[PDB]
């Protein structure tokens, strides 16, 4: 698209080679000199290193806890730049930024990429519907969606099924688990009493990594209680 | 090599109030361009911080008068003529020609809105993680605006710690009030140990903390 | 088989002696629409997914996709008008109660 | 028994040959189009699987000819093409994914005009009576007969409409087209959304002098589902400013289970005339049945928009 | 308004020649009166644990028994639940405040 295309990042395990292709288009990548400043989660940038333009003798000089396996390259004539990643470890988890510096012809921010170095492979979420069983509020159904037990913390997409005006969803921040790496979070939703009084079962839709979207479906409660008599 | 810093870390300003932040030169500020290293960042959520003035002494095409690139040599300066409640974040001065990136130390921003009581809504946990070994006890608290909260999950009166914690979101983009979230992890094993499970969250904006208790066995 | 087993299964009644297997299986110009094809229609039918197939769903089936080749309106209209040509004088709600096995008692 | 070069006006074969080879290009039918003149493969989806084609294509050449016998959907995506004069007489074109008669997608400025397309349609992931989902174009002096058929139970969401199925872009609109649609479907749960004309309209989308007439049928009330459109919530932020306009909308529908003009209302309804006759428009579960939502008015008959019989395909 | 047309069920807890125990039906049981009838009229009732409970539209039997003097008596409770608003009172709803079993046990 219209960013900064970084390749072959992604999941891997610790001490393995990670390769990365930030890749450009519609800009001359030529006249503006690829820098690769990774960033902690949450953190500030972290300084790495670059490699100078094709005019500028495309000098590649390494940070110093980092040098000694880094190959930083580029290609031109692609539109592309290179990272090389070798010996992973826990501390190599960042959020990689390849930018463009050295050209006022283009200064476009890019997106970056995530790296995330643990041997776990990824883990699909446990979708657990939540229901509100306890009294609803007066005006609003409130209804959540639970996914636990989920290793990759790159994008997870919660959207629900139908919303409308009066709907505001909220969704929190990956939380990571005390065991296994593993990641966990909820999604909140607020609906209309209106809507769920005709029906209207609002589905859960939750995104991973890689796995596809597991619609689980929440039957939203307007169930009038059974009046079951006693036995007399 | 050419050292970019910041003295201020954290601040909280009200919309429509002046910030000024000044960023200094260790290094020469020879850039590719010959213009100067320093390059202004403002943090936005969702994304990372985005420049707002670039070459130093030229003003960006674009920026508001809000940010001012005026500073020039070693010395630069930049304002916040007025705050946004969209302008939280922090704020970083950096060099773009040499290999050291050197990053300001940042002054990450926040605004200041009217303390307000978040809404309680307890979720039981679901019977299907149960069958799992695990369990999920869900306390939720919506749009509050001081982040600064303490959650205790008291098992049977009880606080453990250690296994289940909180999760709060940011600034919201309507009214930038934040919401909490926490999730009680118990294993199947303490599950059945215990019978009445319960959500305490301190807060400022609270006059009391509000806790609502599910008996074992209600799904 | 799909096919032809629903049909067989869901249409076992017999108006007098005719029997509604042969006439809905075969004569499906017995209201007009001459073009149609029995074996087509089996096929289809038996193509048509497990929603359609699906027994809950039998009057919504013929509505929506048997329809239109017996040139019908409803499933109801097409066992009126069966009920019309053969065994005429005796109305429809008397040839029902003839007709199911199950014991149907009624209080005016 | 011949074939044509210099224009392909001959066979479907070889302007689907054409189309493969030159997606970029100005092309023109002479003659009368069977499309199971081509084998379909089983892999392939759509009887053009290039990015765009059929970017200069039209029926203009004296007499407008018809394309009879579709199997699968036309093309695979539009980038500023042009179809131009297009009938359609038979059409079984089905698949589980996106299915429409004529492109599954259209990413920018591509305008439609004349098209007429007339058969089944059937789909499961998603279904478009003209295009499943269309981006940043427009479509004028169109028409669809026929039935549709996505009563699958799945919980995944399809935009389904009687001519587009989803419609998001600021610059995207339907204005003067036809649904004679026969549909019956099962919207199921309510991100599946169901329109008579549109299926859903999105990023300030108007429709402006559309007519439905053919039935709308969701069995289960549950889903969004409308007689000429089915909402126009956008999925982004909620503002009414993208929710997008209906204009001069008229709906003879006799839509069971939803509503006759806009199958969810809002507060601030930015369509500007709504047009019913007197039809099927009565379709604890107290409001999952309609009582005239937003179609109480012009409930007379109203004339009818007269861009169906010029056409003239025969 | 009395001509409308609502369903009661009896409880699908079917016997056995052996002993009385009337084990419940599931729609995947194999006595054949749900394989044939009960199956394919398909629509799911909660089975409670106890009390023939109305649902608004409709009625099952749970507990009761419909032959029975207390099946009756049980009807006419479960009508009073089923036709309250509209038919009983003069098209008149219930009371803002009482529930819906005020008017079941105590009177009608």
């Known amino acids: 698209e219209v960013q900064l295309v970084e390749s072959g990042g992604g999941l891997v395990q610790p001490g393995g080679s990670l390769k990365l292709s930030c890749a450009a288009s519609?800009?001359?990548?030529?006249?503006?000199?690829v820098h690769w400043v990774r960033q902690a989660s949450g953190k500030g940038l972290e300084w790495v290193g670059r490699?100078?333009?094709?005019?500028?003798?495309?000098?590649?000089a390494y940070a110093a806890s980092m040098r000694g396996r880094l190959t930083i390259s580029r290609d031109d004539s692609k539109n592309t730049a290179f990272l090389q990643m070798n010996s992973l470890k826990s501390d190599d988890t960042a959020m990689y930024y390849c930018?463009?510096?050295?050209?006022?012809?283009?200064?476009?921010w890019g997106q970056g990429t995530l790296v995330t170095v643990s041997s776990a492979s990824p883990t699909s979420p446990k979708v657990f519907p939540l229901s509100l069983c306890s009294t609803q509020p007066d005006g609003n159904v409130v209804i959540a969606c639970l996914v636990q037990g989920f290793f990759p913390q790159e994008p997870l997409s919660v959207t629900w099924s139908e919303s409308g005006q009066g709907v505001t969803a909220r969704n929190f921040p990956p939380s990571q688990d005390a065991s296994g790496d593993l990641y966990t979070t909820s999604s909140q939703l607020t609906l209309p009493a209106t809507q769920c009084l005709a029906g209207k079962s609002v589905t859960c839709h939750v995104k991973h990594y890689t796995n596809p979207s597991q619609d689980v479906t929440v039957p939203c409660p307007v169930p009038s209680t059974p009046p079951t008599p006693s036995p007399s | 090599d050419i050292v970019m810093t910041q003295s201020p870390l954290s601040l909280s300003v009200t919309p429509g109030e002046p910030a000024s932040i000044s960023c200094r030169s260790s290094?020469?500020?020879?850039?590719?361009?010959?213009?100067?290293?320093l390059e202004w960042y403002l943090q936005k959520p969702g994304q990372s911080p985005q420049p707002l003035i670039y070459?130093?002494?030229t003003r960006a095409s674009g920026v508001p008068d809000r940010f001012s690139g005026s500073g020039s040599g070693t010395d630069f300066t930049l304002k916040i003529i007025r705050v946004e409640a969209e302008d939280a974040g922090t704020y970083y001065c950096?060099?773009?020609?040499?290999?050291?990136?050197?990053f300001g130390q940042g002054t990450r921003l926040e605004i200041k809105r009217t303390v307000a009581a978040p809404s309680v809504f307890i979720f039981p946990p679901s019977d299907e993680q149960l069958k799992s070994g695990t369990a999920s006890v869900v306390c939720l608290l919506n749009n509050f605006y001081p982040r600064e909260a303490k959650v205790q999950w008291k098992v049977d009166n009880a606080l453990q710690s250690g296994n289940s914690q909180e999760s709060v979101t940011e600034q919201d983009s309507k009214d930038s009030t934040y919401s909490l979230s926490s999730t009680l992890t118990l294993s199947k094993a303490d599950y059945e140990k215990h019978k009445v499970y319960a959500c305490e969250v301190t807060h400022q904006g609270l006059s009391s903390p509000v806790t609502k208790s599910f008996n074992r066995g209600e799904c | 088989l799909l096919g032809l087993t629903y049909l067989e299964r869901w249409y076992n009644f017999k108006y007098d002696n005719t029997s509604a297997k042969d006439l809905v299986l075969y004569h499906l110009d017995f209201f007009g629409k001459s073009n149609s094809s029995a074996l087509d229609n089996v096929i289809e039918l038996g193509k048509s997914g497990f929603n359609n197939l699906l027994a809950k769903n039998n009057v919504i089936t013929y509505n929506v996709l048997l329809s239109k080749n017996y040139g019908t309106e409803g499933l109801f209209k097409a066992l009126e008008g069966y009920r019309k040509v053969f065994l005429p004088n005796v109305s429809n709600n008397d040839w029902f109660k003839t007709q199911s096995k199950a014991y149907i008692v009624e209080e005016k | 028994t011949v074939n044509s070069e210099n224009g392909v006006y001959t066979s479907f074969k070889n302007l689907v040959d054409a189309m493969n080879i030159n997606p970029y290009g100005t092309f023109r039918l002479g003659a009368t189009m069977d499309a199971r003149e081509v084998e379909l493969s089983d892999g392939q989806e759509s009887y053009i699987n290039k990015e765009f084609s059929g970017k200069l294509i039209g029926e203009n050449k004296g007499k407008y000819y018809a394309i009879y016998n579709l199997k699968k959907p036309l093309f695979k995506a539009l980038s500023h093409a042009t179809i131009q004069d297009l009938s359609i007489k038979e059409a079984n074109v089905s698949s589980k994914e996106d299915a429409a008669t004529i492109a599954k997608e259209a990413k920018n400025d591509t305008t439609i005009a004349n098209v007429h397309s007339s058969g089944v349609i059937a789909g499961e992931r998603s279904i478009g009576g003209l295009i499943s989902q269309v981006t940043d174009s427009t479509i004028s002096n169109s028409s669809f007969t026929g039935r549709i058929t996505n009563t699958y139970d799945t919980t995944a969401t399809y935009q389904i409409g009687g001519l587009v199925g989803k419609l998001s872009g600021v610059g995207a609109l339907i204005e003067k087209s036809i649904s004679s649609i026969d549909m019956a479907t099962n919207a199921n749960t309510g991100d599946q959304v169901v329109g008579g004309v549109a299926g859903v309209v999105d990023k300030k989308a108007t429709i402006r002098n559309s007519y439905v007439e053919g039935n709308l049928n969701n069995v289960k009330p549950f889903g969004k589902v409308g007689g000429v459109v089915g909402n126009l919530w956008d999925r982004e932020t909620s503002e009414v400013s993208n929710s997008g306009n209906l204009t001069n909308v008229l709906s003879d529908v006799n839509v069971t289970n939803g509503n006759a003009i806009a199958g969810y209302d809002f507060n601030g309804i930015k369509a500007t005339n709504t047009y019913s006759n007197k039809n099927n428009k009565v379709v604890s579960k107290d409001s999952e049945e309609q009582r005239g939502t937003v179609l109480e008015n012009n409930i007379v008959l109203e004339k009818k928009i007269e861009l169906v019989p010029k056409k003239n395909t025969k | 308004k009395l001509f409308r047309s609502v369903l009661v069920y009896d409880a699908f807890r079917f016997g056995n020649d052996t002993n009385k125990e009337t084990q419940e039906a599931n729609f995947e049981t194999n006595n054949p009166v749900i394989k044939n009838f009960f199956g394919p009229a398909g629509n799911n009732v909660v089975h409670n644990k106890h009390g023939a409970y109305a649902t608004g539209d409709a009625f099952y039997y749970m507990a009761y028994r419909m032959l029975d003097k207390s099946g009756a008596v049980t009807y006419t409770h479960a009508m009073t639940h089923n036709s309250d608003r509209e038919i009983y009172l003069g098209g008149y709803g219930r009371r803002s405040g009482l529930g819906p079993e005020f008017y079941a046990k105590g009177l009608l």
């Open positions: 930018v463009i510096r050295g050209d006022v012809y283009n200064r476009q």
């Open positions: 519609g800009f001359t990548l030529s006249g503006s000199n």
């Open positions: 490699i100078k333009r094709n005019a500028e003798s495309d000098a590649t």
């Open positions: 950096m060099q773009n020609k040499q290999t050291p990136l050197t």
């Open positions: 070459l130093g002494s």
């Open positions: 290094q020469s500020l020879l850039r590719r361009d010959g213009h100067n290293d």
